[PDB]
Design a protein around this ligand. Structure first.
Ligand SMILES: [Cl-]
Lengths: 99, 271, 9
């Protein structure tokens, strides 16, 4: 009765070094709705993170957007860290602007 | 274009840790416009779109009264279902309800729906005729008979065909700039060394889109990696499709983008 | 606008 989250980490707008933007982590297709999502800057949890109101798809599975304002640079790394009952350990998905 | 108004209710039990957390959100098409969270301090239905802020105090007071009562009934449902399924009182469980109406390009009623799920699985659903119910199992047959005897379908049908259509049309008018808009996708391609070709569509609205890859004009359906359409956070959507290509054979591949906002479908090539 | 009808399974 459990469904594992799909995870996508990405910016709202094409990334340009030194220009403000938003870093997104979109989790979808999961059940139950209980989920832990953190945005990381160079391996450390970002404090001011917001998220959308819980909603769900035609198949009843849930989706949520977590987001934070950020200014990308050449060397700072960003990631989304997700824990859920379907996971043995937290899954970390690194932001890849060149994807 | 066709349009929809939909509400999504989620309630999750947490025995020992107080009453269940109830969340409701309303959408017109792919645009969220209201929300309620039982844990939040306001204890009120709240606006999530610019065009709903127009609504006066009577609207927010009425929606708040109704949403709170809905939160109470789904709390009772969680107890009822735990009982129907002889489940423990200690476990956390979920109920979900979704309902709404669709109008055609003429803005007249097209269809209505009202569906319920327990622990993420179909429980009971109103049929398209808006007169009969589909029960998933034995437990749901009890609810089905209960709602038939109480003539729930007839009362819901009056909402789905009348009130739901009335307010959907009102919202479409009031939120014309947001709701009756089409943002054509902004597209590009990336190449990663066999090689990966990835076709991108950004900043589009509504969310419905088709991304396809073709090799020498043949659909590569079984070989295309397609991600779930995702929100940009600014009211638009993004999506990509990728194919693993024999190194040196990129010229044979074309990406095709179909979206309501495009005067004509787009073709992308790795050049 | 929300449905105003209260129902319980
Ligand atoms: Cl921005």
């Amino acid at each position: 009765i459990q469904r594992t989250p799909k995870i996508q980490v990405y910016s709202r707008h094409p990334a340009e070094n030194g220009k403000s933007n938003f870093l997104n982590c979109y989790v979808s297709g999961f059940h139950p709705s209980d989920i832990e999502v953190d945005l990381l800057k160079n391996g450390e949890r970002i404090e001011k993170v917001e998220h959308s109101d819980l909603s769900f798809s035609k198949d009843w599975s849930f989706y949520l957007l977590y987001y934070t304002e950020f200014t990308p640079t050449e060397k700072d790394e960003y990631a989304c860290r997700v824990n859920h009952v379907t996971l043995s350990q937290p899954k970390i998905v690194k932001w890849d602007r060149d994807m | 274009g066709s349009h929809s108004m939909r509400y999504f209710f989620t309630s999750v039990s947490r025995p020992g840790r107080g009453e269940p957390r109830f969340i409701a959100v309303g959408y017109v098409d792919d645009t969220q416009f209201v929300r309620f969270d039982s844990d939040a301090a306001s204890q009120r239905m709240e606006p999530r779109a610019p065009w709903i802020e127009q609504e006066g105090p009577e609207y927010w007071d009425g929606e708040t009264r109704k949403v709170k009562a809905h939160s109470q009934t789904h709390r009772v449902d969680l107890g009822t279902l735990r009982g129907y399924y002889n489940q423990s009182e200690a476990g956390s469980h979920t109920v979900q309800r979704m309902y709404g109406c669709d109008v055609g390009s003429d803005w007249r009623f097209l269809r209505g729906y009202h569906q319920y799920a327990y622990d993420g699985k179909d429980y009971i659903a109103l049929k398209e005729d808006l007169r009969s119910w589909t029960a998933a199992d034995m437990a749901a047959q009890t609810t089905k008979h209960k709602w038939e005897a109480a003539h729930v379908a007839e009362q819901l049908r009056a909402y789905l065909e009348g009130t739901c259509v009335e307010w959907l049309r009102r919202y479409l008018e009031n939120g014309k700039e947001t709701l009756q808009r089409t943002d054509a996708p902004k597209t590009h391609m990336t190449h990663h060394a066999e090689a990966t070709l990835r076709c991108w569509a950004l900043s589009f609205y509504p969310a419905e889109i088709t991304l396809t890859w073709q090799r020498d004009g043949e659909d590569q359906t079984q070989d295309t990696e397609l991600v779930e359409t995702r929100p940009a956070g600014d009211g638009t959507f993004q999506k990509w499709a990728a194919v693993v290509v024999p190194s040196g054979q990129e010229q044979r591949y074309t990406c095709h983008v179909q979206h309501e906002g495009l005067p004509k479908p787009l073709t992308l090539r790795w050049e | 606008c929300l449905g105003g009808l209260l129902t319980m399974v």
